[PDB]
């Protein structure tokens, strides 16, 4: 396998610009499979409690405190 | 003349808003550098809140209703 030059971290889909600069990994979020909400408001959207929890963990860590 | 009542995050409308200001992005900023203003306040800009707060209003939604009754200028640079 060839060894991966300075040039082979800017150039490709893996180089800086489109794996790191303009598109990177996020704090505060998740994700799961979707069902249909057919008892939803249009500006409503079911969250897991679960998932609810962790995403806004240091939130309710400080109103709980 | 009725829409109806409208349900938390959708209230208030966004066109009642818009006539406060001049577009979407101004209206962002504007409840926005007031949320900051007021939550400051609570841990003493310091001013408002200025209409009655329901107990634990964000106080982005505090900023919202302000701006619906036109309580704050709300000058653009």
Do not use: W
Request: charged share 25%; aromatic share 8%; hydrophobic share 35%.
């Amino acid at each position: 396998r060839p060894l991966k030059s300075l040039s082979d971290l800017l150039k490709g889909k893996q180089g800086r610009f489109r794996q790191n600069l303009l598109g990177k990994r996020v704090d505060y979020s998740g994700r799961s499979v979707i069902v249909v909400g057919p008892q939803l408001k249009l500006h409503q959207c079911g969250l897991p409690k679960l998932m609810a929890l962790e995403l806004f963990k240091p939130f309710v860590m400080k109103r709980l405190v | 003349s009725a829409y109806d009542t409208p349900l938390g995050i959708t209230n208030p409308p966004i066109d009642e808003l818009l006539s406060r200001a001049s577009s979407k992005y101004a209206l962002v900023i504007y409840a926005a550098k007031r949320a900051r203003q007021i939550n400051d306040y609570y841990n003493q800009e310091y001013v408002g809140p200025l209409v009655e707060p329901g107990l634990q209003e964000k106080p982005l939604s505090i900023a919202l209703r302000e701006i619906h009754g036109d309580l704050l200028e709300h000058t653009e640079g």
